[PDB]
DNA sequence: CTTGACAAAAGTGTTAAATTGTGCTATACTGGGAGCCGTCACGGATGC
DNA sequence: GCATCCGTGAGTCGAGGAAGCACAATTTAACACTTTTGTCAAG
């Protein structure tokens, strides 16, 4: 995933020039980036496909090598009679296919090289290959898969950091307008407008749309300002994580259950990054045994169904 | 992978007569020495050992290379399992 | 899942023995009752009537 | 190395006495220092009181004191000999004659009493062991609503565990309440009027709920009399017998009302005046007494439910797992009910002894015979399961296992029956029981520990401490306090800022009966101690908790405990300052008594002269095997001449470094994926780690044997051992054991012994070959002691004990026991298996050369690669935190001590890391090195990620992400840089007991069982593996009908098809066709023994013998 | 690579009237920095005899020819009143990193056998630096920092590490098909 | 191939210990003792 | 229809290993002797 992902940049994005020499002296004067969205003529290109025009793949990566261009950079490939416009990661993961195959021709209709390979992408890849050349090519695939991926996630720089758990700041906002929310909802409770249930009802209904924010803000600053943060990516390409976990990482905990089933009037608005408070942790910790219980109990359910099943379907 | 194992299974209506076919080969050929084997010298396989190479002693290996060549037959009521056991007997004592 | 689901719909229950010893109410196999049945019509005997 | 300490939280009170859950239990049931005279009725003392006098109805036996000698060996002694640690009791009794009047006075020796010894453990068979105290159900008066018919309650009466019947109270649908005793309703009318309850008392008492009375009113047995009512219930709880007075009293008072059979207990006792708000003379339901009973606590527990039913305020259920209903009975009370059930048992003997046999001349001796007494003692340390055996890997491992509380065991829940209720956290476990600490599994929520700050009270129900507060301003009152007690409060969070001692915050986080509430400083009433209550003392050595999901938290505390001891351990970086009180109260390391001077400083001892003058020589305990195999001893830290003050340290213990708890060592750690290595939780390591012995741990094995007395012969321990060779007895001394400091490997003798020959002919095979060779066949046969495969290492003890040694109690026929002792010192290898405090675990998968490892610009490679992946999943971020102050704190130089919820947080840690770069960097400037070309181009790709801010110098932009815990790291491999910059620090991480040198098992051909002749289980054994039902599931699946036979017959249990294809191998042939089963066979037989006829037929029908015609007549 | 202590038969034991066990001593021990003035030396065998009370450090080894000691200072052992001290500690020559349990090197029956760190270099660092000559301003400038225990010096480690990169350039001759 | 001494090498036959099985005690004795107790599902059978 | 009862079921490897005596009847042991067996030298 981390090779076949492009660059994106801001430093231009969006100056219109007249002719490719107008922009590619922008790019020199420091006034537009390599990978920014820009307008040559009529048509929206970037600084690096004017700039960086390979006649093919070997080329390509030799710039590479000599630290011309990053793999993530979109530039101009000669690949297989087409000029493509893509960046020399995603042509390196071409290559990886066509010689794992041995088929440059079949290789170049397994892969969709327009996308970063996530998991479902790499899995619709060796579905595909399975069908077009057999268990003994397929096989062959998935072992170039893995040198390659192991390869590139050592060089390419992925760590966990306590600031990369990045803390949206919508969250402070969010978190005032939930406390002026609720404080109406008191007022409103004391003046018997709505009774104890709808009272609760509507709390954590609050709590649950403020959740809901919050992990949309976390996942927005993500895909804007650090599109190569470890725990974006991670979730992103389907190596690690979910929405769920990550807001709970930068943004807030949420709402807790009672032991009885019920939930905390209070949710923990605390982040594993900040840390949580005493209370807030023991309250946390009713659900966390609960879990390991359901857990417990559930393996002996469905060990005892497999066998049931088993019994009566063995012939 | 197994070399050629895509070839193997489309040379079987099902997946388990393949490996009946090569187990029963494989028995073959440990019962006579590897005498009656339909590879040629060139194509024996081979083990790299530290005197030499020397003739693969896997008889399973050996059979799922005769199986590829095409060199064989296989099928149900061939012939009669006595006879056959009879007539191997003497062309490989 | 269809196969298990076959399993569990696999017998039936005698409602009208016919020609036949069986009771009803007895509990047997679909298929035993359907190669039963086949048997006694060839033989133009009431077939046995089942419920699933 | 300086130590910064962080926290703003003052604790008024320190920790209380980590083991004085076992050492005062104990010492107050054996009141063994009090005078005989001051004892109170507690202990065994009451055992003794409730049993006594044992009267014949005139021979009275009667119990005067009590008293413990001193234990016949020390504890040494009795590890060495295999014994038990005991002091033996004796009892004064005096027999007197109601005829004549005489007394007579004696001390009888009723057995032995196992000690405690001082860290709060047994010596049990020469076992160390641990008595797990029991959380159960408290005794008393309970109120539940019936689930069945809403807005109906049942009155639970429950006494202490079998100690009396379950009794419940029920208003059924018809208005009569009946009453359930052994699972045999009645009508509580019927026993209402045996305790002397006439209609008008009802009605007086009673009458004022409603209906309910009425329905308890009825006339057909109000003017029956007392006693036939007693004899009409008699018939009611046991039909058959013939009802007489005399059986029918003697059946009811047994029931309710005899304090030797029914014992509602102290705390039952208190809970049901607490409740029903009555005053118990006694703690049985009723009394009798003037030849009538007399009701004690049915008619104040039937006023409760009918109060409850009619609607009263003040009436409430009761929830069974709230803390205040729920108590811990420890090792001292478990150890007095085994005692009472045995001392019942002695006086059972003594009244059918003393209507028997010289009735006139009869003394205490000869009635009282104590092997009953005995026998309970030594069941309940020995096959009890609260009995265990005790877990003392390291110092922490064994204080951890006497703080446990389980709710299984005699008188507790099934491992099994146990529902989520009895598994969850409640809400009054708060500052009791640790919320996080419990065994992921089956056992989850059924085992637990003690909170840090808690303590068992005297009637066994949890307190915690609380600050009282009073005006708005926290005072130093520490007041101890029971879940029910704590439900009257609002209680205040140990967080709160305060203002010297006022309340500065204007709103306050408290608790309300556990709920959270947003309180002012006016309506706080108490305060917590410190956030450390709440959890238990493995919890609270994980630094940056807060920032740890609970569910890693709990591997984090769990794998503390299995951590080994290293040659060269080493406190934590990043300590929460719990680490001088564990090793302190493990009482594994070795203090000054008072101040003196150390006069000589050995390895083997340590003498100090104290300021009175005494001379004190200190033992060291040298190499010492635990239960776990692990080797303890203790280190001297002390040098001769030196002064020394009351409690300083002399001497390290296990994993101990000056004092603090060292459980593993402080490691350079990168957070990075290494080229598959780290893949799925697996860990690279270098080999710089392995060359400074690092993660070293020294390992014990004990190998015994036995030369017993036969028919054929006695076995002999002997060098001159048939058919061997002088190689294979090199190393064998005269006396024909291993000679002390050789090395043995798998196979190697370690003791020689002969036994004689079973006679038998030989074979006519062997009887020619001896004939052809002239060799006369020897009486006797090999049958020594070897190193079993996968093991061996150094012999550094032998130990001979002989029959007639003075404490050597051998087994009879045993003429004599040999132990040897082989240590082996185990470097890190690929597949141990590391951990840290956060719950992150894995084992070694790769161990690279030096010049391999990630490096600093500066040179020093990494010492251990961590994989990024397994963070997010987990959100233990407390690692990544401690990585960073470990950072700081590697160029720095100093530790840290971050108490958990009060500690380091962010901006102080990137302080720290501000001033850590200019030693980093600044050290370099110096030197007269700028900035490598290499960190340049790091530096522009750091840029492109938002790491750093652009515009700014290259030294500025290292030092940006210096403050993030990230540097520029190079690859050994090739000298490039990493794309991008990686979190390097510090890191605390331990060698858990989990090694693959001790799991790695194969075998082909072994031992066989008895009746199924299937290979044995176990690695000890040489067993096989277990092919379950899954397994032959998988095999079926893959259509694999022969790789499925084999293992069922050939590999398994085909005695002939085993045999022929082991040979049919080492002669180069393909193994043959299998054959029927063994357990078969087996099957057949047994069916048979059930008389069922079970006939295997063939195609046609006939028969088909399967047993060879071995059982065809 | 192998230490004799007299009265001592392995490694698992304490020592009268010394502060340290065995195990800590050859700890120390592995610290011990020898260099051999003669080229051709491979063996050694160094006598320590020390009667308490002191603090015996590597400086207390008798003198042998063409061995010194780098770090004479080094601590060894705590002898109190009473404590003896008669070891020989075998010194060999060798590259790498062997384990006692490969060489089991024993001079006699109850030597202990020690694990092996040959190598002279402690660390190593090299720093790239952006020079510039003439017109030409993407040049490199190379700095090897060594750091050795004394026994061989930098540069002579560095000249033996150019050898063995020269030598194996020279495999890459005769080749072949 | 035998051919006669020879000597243990073994077996048969009493005899006496050593072990094992069995019968017998005469004031009057006349119906036991230990659980006690926190789960939840289902059928399936009977009390009617 | 219906409760109430009883009966059966609830994941997998691993590691932990108190009569006493009398007397008769039967069995075991220790002799004794004769009767094979195994060698011997011859012859
Ligand atoms: C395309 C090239 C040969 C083309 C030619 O013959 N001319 C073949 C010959 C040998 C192949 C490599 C090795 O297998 C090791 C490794 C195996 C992994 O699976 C994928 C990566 C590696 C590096 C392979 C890449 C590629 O596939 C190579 C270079
Ligand atoms: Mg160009
Ligand atoms: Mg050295």
Redesign the pocket.
Same mark, same amino acid.
């Given at each position: 995933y981390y090779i076949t992902q492009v660059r994106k940049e801001k430093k231009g994005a969006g100056l219109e020039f007249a002719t490719p020499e107008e922009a590619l002296a922008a790019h020199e004067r420091g006034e537009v980036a390599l990978n920014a969205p820009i307008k040559v003529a009529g048509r929206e290109t970037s600084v690096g496909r004017l700039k960086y025009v390979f006649a093919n793949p070997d080329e390509a990566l030799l710039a590479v090598a000599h630290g011309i261009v990053d793999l993530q950079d979109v530039v101009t490939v000669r690949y297989m009679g087409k000029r493509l416009e893509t960046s020399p990661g995603r042509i390196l993961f071409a290559r990886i296919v066509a010689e794992a195959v041995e088929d440059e021709k079949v290789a170049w209709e397994l892969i969709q090289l327009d996308v970063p390979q996530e998991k479902n992408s790499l899995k619709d890849l060796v579905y595909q290959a399975f069908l077009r050349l057999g268990m003994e090519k397929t096989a062959r695939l998935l072992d170039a898969l893995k040198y390659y991926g192991f390869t590139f996630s050592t060089t390419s720089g992925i760590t966990i950091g306590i600031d990369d758990a990045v803390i949206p700041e919508e969250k402070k906002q969010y978190l005032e307008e939930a406390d002026r929310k609720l404080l109406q909802i008191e007022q409103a409770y004391e003046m018997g407008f709505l009774t104890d249930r709808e009272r609760y009802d509507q709390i954590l209904q609050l709590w649950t749309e403020t959740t809901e924010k919050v992990t949309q803000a976390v996942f927005k600053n993500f895909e804007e300002n650090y599109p190569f943060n470890p725990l974006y990516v991670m979730a992103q390409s389907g190596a690690r994580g979910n929405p769920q976990q990550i807001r709970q990482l930068c943004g807030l905990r949420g709402l807790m259950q009672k032991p009885s089933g019920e939930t905390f009037e209070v949710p923990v608005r605390s982040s594993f990054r900040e840390g949580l408070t005493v209370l807030e942790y023991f309250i946390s910790s009713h659900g966390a045994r609960k879990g390991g219980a359901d857990t417990?109990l559930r393996?002996?359910?469905?060990?005892?169904l497999?066998?049931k099943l088993v019994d009566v379907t063995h012939e | 992978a197994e070399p050629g194992i895509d070839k193997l299974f489309g040379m079987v209506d099902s997946k388990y007569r393949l490996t009946v076919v090569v187990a029963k080969r494989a028995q073959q050929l440990l019962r006579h020495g590897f005498k009656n084997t339909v590879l040629e010298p060139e194509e024996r396989p081979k083990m790299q050992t530290l005197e030499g190479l020397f003739d693969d002693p896997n008889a399973v290996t050996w059979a799922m290379k005769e199986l590829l060549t095409g060199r064989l037959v296989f099928g149900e009521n061939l012939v009669p399992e006595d006879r056959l056991q009879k007539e191997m007997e003497r062309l490989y004592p | 899942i269809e196969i298990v689901v076959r399993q569990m719909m696999k017998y039936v229950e005698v409602t009208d023995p016919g020609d036949s010893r069986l009771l009803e109410g007895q509990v047997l196999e679909k298929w035993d009752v359907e190669a039963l049945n086949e048997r006694l019509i060839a033989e133009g005997k009431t077939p046995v009537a089942w419920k699933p | 190395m300086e130590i910064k300490r962080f926290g703003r939280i003052r604790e008024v009170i320190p920790l209380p006495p980590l083991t004085e859950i076992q050492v005062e239990s104990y010492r107050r049931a054996l009141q063994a220092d009090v005078p005989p005279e001051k004892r109170e009725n507690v202990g065994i003392q009451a055992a003794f009181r409730e049993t006594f006098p044992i009267e014949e109805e005139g021979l009275v036996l009667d119990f005067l004191e009590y008293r413990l000698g001193e234990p016949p060996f020390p504890q040494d002694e009795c590890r060495e000999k295999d014994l038990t640690y005991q002091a033996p009791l004796y009892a004064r009794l005096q027999l007197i004659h109601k005829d004549t009047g005489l007394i007579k006075e004696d001390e009888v020796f009723l057995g032995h009493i196992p000690l405690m010894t001082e860290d709060g453990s047994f010596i049990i068979n020469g076992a160390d062991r641990v008595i797990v105290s029991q959380? !159960?159900?408290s005794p008393g008066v309970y109120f539940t609503p019936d689930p069945?018919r809403p807005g109906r309650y049942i009155a639970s009466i429950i006494?202490l565990? #079998?100690? &009396?019947?379950?009794?419940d109270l029920e208003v059924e649908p018809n208005g009569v309440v009946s009453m359930? @005793?052994? #699972?045999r309703k009645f009508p509580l009318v019927l026993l209402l009027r045996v305790l002397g309850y006439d209609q008008e008392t009802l009605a007086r008492e009673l009458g004022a709920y409603g209906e309910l009375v009425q329905g308890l009113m009825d006339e057909s047995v109000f003017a029956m009399r007392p006693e036939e009512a007693l004899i009409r219930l008699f018939t009611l709880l046991?039909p =058959?017998?013939?009802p007489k007075r005399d059986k029918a009293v003697a +059946?009811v008072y *047994?029931?309710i009302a005899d304090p030797r059979? +029914?014992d509602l207990g102290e705390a039952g006792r208190y809970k049901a005046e607490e409740k029903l708000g009555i005053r118990l003379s006694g703690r049985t339901l009723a009394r009798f007494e003037d030849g009538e009973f007399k009701d004690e606590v049915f008619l104040p527990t039937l006023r409760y439910l009918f109060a409850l039913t009619a609607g009263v305020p003040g009436h409430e259920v009761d929830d069974?797992?709230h803390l205040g209903n729920?108590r811990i009975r420890t090792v001292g009370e478990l150890m007095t009910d085994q005692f009472r059930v045995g001392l019942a048992r002695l006086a059972?003997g003594v009244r059918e002894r003393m209507l028997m046999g010289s009735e006139d001349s009869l003394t205490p001796a000869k009635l009282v015979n104590s092997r009953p007494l005995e026998a309970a003692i030594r069941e309940f340390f020995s096959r009890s399961q609260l009995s265990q055996?005790k877990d003392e890997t390291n110092p922490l491992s064994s204080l951890r296992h006497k703080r446990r509380i389980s709710?299984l065991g005699p008188? *507790?829940?099934?491992r099994?029956?146990? &529902?989520f209720? @009895?598994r969850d956290v409640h809400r009054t476990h708060y500052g009791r029981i640790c919320p996080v600490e419990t065994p992921e *599994?089956?056992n989850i929520g059924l085992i637990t520990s003690l909170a840090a700050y808690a303590r068992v009270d005297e009637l066994g129900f949890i307190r915690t401490p609380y600050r009282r507060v009073v005006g708005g301003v926290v005072t130093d009152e520490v007041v101890y306090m029971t879940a029910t007690e704590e439900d009257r409060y609002t209680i205040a969070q140990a967080n709160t800022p305060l203002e010297g001692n006022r309340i500065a915050a204007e709103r306050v986080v408290a608790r309300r009966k556990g709920e959270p509430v947003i309180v002012s400083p006016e309506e706080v009433e108490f305060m917590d101690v410190s956030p450390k209550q709440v959890f238990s003392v493995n919890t609270n050595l994980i630094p940056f908790l807060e920032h740890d999901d609970a569910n890693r938290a709990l591997m984090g505390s769990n794998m503390q405990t299995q951590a080994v001891p290293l040659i060269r351990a080493q406190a934590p970086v990043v300590m929460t300052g719990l680490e001088e009180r564990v090793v302190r109260d493990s009482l594994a390391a070795l203090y000054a008594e008072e101040d003196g001077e150390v006069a000589k400083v050995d390895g083997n001892r340590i003498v100090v002269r104290y300021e009175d003058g005494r001379l004190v020589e200190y033992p060291l305990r040298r190499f010492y095997r635990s239960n776990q195999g692990t080797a303890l001893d203790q280190r001297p830290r002390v040098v001769v001449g030196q002064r020394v003050r009351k409690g300083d340290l002399l001497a390290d213990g296990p994993a101990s470094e000056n004092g603090f708890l060292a459980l593993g060592q402080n490691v350079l750690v990168a957070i990075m994926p290494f080229d598959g290595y780290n893949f799925e939780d697996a860990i690279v390591i270098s080999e710089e780690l392995l060359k400074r012995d690092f993660y070293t741990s020294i390992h014990i094995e004990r190998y015994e044997i036995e030369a017993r007395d036969t028919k054929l012969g006695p076995e002999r321990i002997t060098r001159d051992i048939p058919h061997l060779s002088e190689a294979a007895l090199r190393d064998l001394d005269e006396e024909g054991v291993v000679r002390i400091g050789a090395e043995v490997k798998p196979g190697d003798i370690l003791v020689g012994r002969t036994s004689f020959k079973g006679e038998s002919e030989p074979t006519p095979e062997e009887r020619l070959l001896r004939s052809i060779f002239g060799e006369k066949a020897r009486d006797v046969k090999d049958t020594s002691l070897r190193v079993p495969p996968g093991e061996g290492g150094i012999v550094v003890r032998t130990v001979r004990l002989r029959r007639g040694d003075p404490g050597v109690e051998l087994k009879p026929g045993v003429r004599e026991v040999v132990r040897v002792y082989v240590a082996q010192k185990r470097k890190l290898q690929v597949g141990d298996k590391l951990a840290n405090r956060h719950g992150n675990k894995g084992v070694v998968a790769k161990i690279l050369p030096v010049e391999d490892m990630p490096h600093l610009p500066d040179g020093t490679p990494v010492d251990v690669i961590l994989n990024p992946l397994g963070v997010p999943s987990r959100m233990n971020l407390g690692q990544i935190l401690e990585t960073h102050l470990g950072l700081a704190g590697y160029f720095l130089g100093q530790r840290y001590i971050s108490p958990i919820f009060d500690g380091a947080k962010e901006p102080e840690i990137k302080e720290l890391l501000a001033q850590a770069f200019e030693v980093y960097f600044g050290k370099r400037k110096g030197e007269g090195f700028g900035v490598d070309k290499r960190e340049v181009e790091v530096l522009r790709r750091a840029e492109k990620l938002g790491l750093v801010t652009p515009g700014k110098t290259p030294e500025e932009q290292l030092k940006e992400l210096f403050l993030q815990g990230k540097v520029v790291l190079y690859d050994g491999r090739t000298g490039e840089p990493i794309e991008g910059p990686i979190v390097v620090g510090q890191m605390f991480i331990m060698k858990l007991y989990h090694m693959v040198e001790?799991?790695m !098992?194969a075998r082909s051909t072994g031992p066989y069982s008895l009746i199924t002749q299937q290979p044995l289980?176990? #690695?000890?054994?040489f *067993?096989?593996?277990?092919? =379950?039902?899954?397994?032959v599931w998988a095999l079926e699946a893959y259509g694999a009908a022969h790789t499925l036979q084999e293992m069922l017959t050939l590999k398994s249990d085909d005695i002939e098809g085993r045999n022929a294809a082991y040979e049919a191998i080492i002669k180069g042939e393909d193994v043959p066709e299998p054959s029927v089963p063994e357990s078969f066979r087996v099957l057949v037989k047994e069916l048979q023994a059930l008389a069922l006829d079970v006939q295997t037929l063939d195609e046609k029908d006939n028969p088909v013998d399967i047993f060879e015609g071995l059982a065809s007549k | 690579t192998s230490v004799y202590i007299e009265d001592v038969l392995h490694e698992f034991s304490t020592i009268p009237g010394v502060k340290e066990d065995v195990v800590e001593i050859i700890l120390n021990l592995k610290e011990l920095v020898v260099r051999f003035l003669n080229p051709s030396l491979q063996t050694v065998t160094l006598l320590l005899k020390a009667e308490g009370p002191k603090e015996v450090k590597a400086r207390d080894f008798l003198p042998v020819a063409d061995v010194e000691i780098m770090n004479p200072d080094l601590h060894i052992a705590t002898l109190e009143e009473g404590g003896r001290l008669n070891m020989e500690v075998r010194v060999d020559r060798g590259v790498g990193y062997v384990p006692a349990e490969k060489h089991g090197i024993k001079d006699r029956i109850n030597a202990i056998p020690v694990d092996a760190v040959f190598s002279p270099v402690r660390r190593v660092a090299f720093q790239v630096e952006d020079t510039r000559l003439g017109q030409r301003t993407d040049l490199d400038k190379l700095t090897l920092r060594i750091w050795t225990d004394g026994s061989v010096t930098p540069l002579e480690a560095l000249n033996q590490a150019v050898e063995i990169l020269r030598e194996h350039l020279t495999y890459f001759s005769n080749p072949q098909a």
């Open positions: 417990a393996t002996a359910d469905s060990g005892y497999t066998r | - | - | 959380i !159960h159900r069945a006494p565990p #079998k100690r &009396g019947p379950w009794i359930k @005793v052994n #699972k046991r =058959g017998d013939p +059946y *047994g029931l059979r +029914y069974i797992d729920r059972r055996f709710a008188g *507790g829940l099934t099994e029956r146990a &529902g209720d @009895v *599994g089956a001790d799991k !098992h289980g176990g #690695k000890a054994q *067993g096989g593996q277990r092919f =379950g039902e899954m397994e | -």
